[PDB]
């Protein structure tokens, strides 16, 4: 939408949780589990491929 403006990635993930109706404390208080789940999900794609 213009020039790239940097933001830390967990804070971008919190904006995106807001965009679906969940408060952002739910992301910050679960950060490690959410990242573990994303990593297992990405590791399952290359296994199916």
């Amino acid at each position: 939408a213009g020039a790239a403006l940097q933001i830390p990635f967990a804070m971008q993930m919190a904006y995106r949780f807001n965009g679906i109706g969940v408060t952002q404390n739910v992301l910050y208080e679960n950060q490690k589990l959410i990242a573990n789940q994303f990593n297992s999900a990405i590791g399952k794609i290359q296994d199916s491929l």
Binding site: A1, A10, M11, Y28
Partner: protein, 109 residues
């Protein structure tokens, strides 16, 4: 709100004009400009409680902390009407110490 469906930027409004066998759309959009960098933090710890912005981000100009809206820089001081509380400050990665100002009790002298 569909990205790039009505031009580049944040769609404000669009005007139609007729062409021969066709149509022309003049899209008016909003484009952000002249950014500055800041230090930032996800929450703020005060009295053993974690505070999150209601809307906006916590930013630091070098020595002080403010809340701003995310798309236009307009800094304000962090109060209990700017933020909400959840939990204690032991679980959030990158939490920062600052004071969150209450209006009522300095009204009550």
């Amino acid at each position: 709100k569909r990205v790039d469906f009505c031009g580049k930027g944040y769609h404000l409004m669009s005007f139609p004009q007729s062409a021969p066998h066709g149509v022309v759309f003049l899209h008016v959009t909003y484009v952000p400009a002249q950014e500055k960098n800041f230090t930032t933090a996800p929450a703020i710890c005060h009295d053993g409680k974690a505070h999150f912005p209601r809307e906006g981000v916590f930013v630091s100009n070098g020595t002080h902390w403010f809340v701003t809206q995310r798309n236009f820089y307009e800094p304000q001081i962090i109060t209990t009407d700017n933020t909400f509380v959840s939990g204690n400050c032991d679980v959030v990665i990158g939490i920062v110490n600052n004071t969150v100002y209450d209006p009522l009790q300095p009204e009550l002298d």
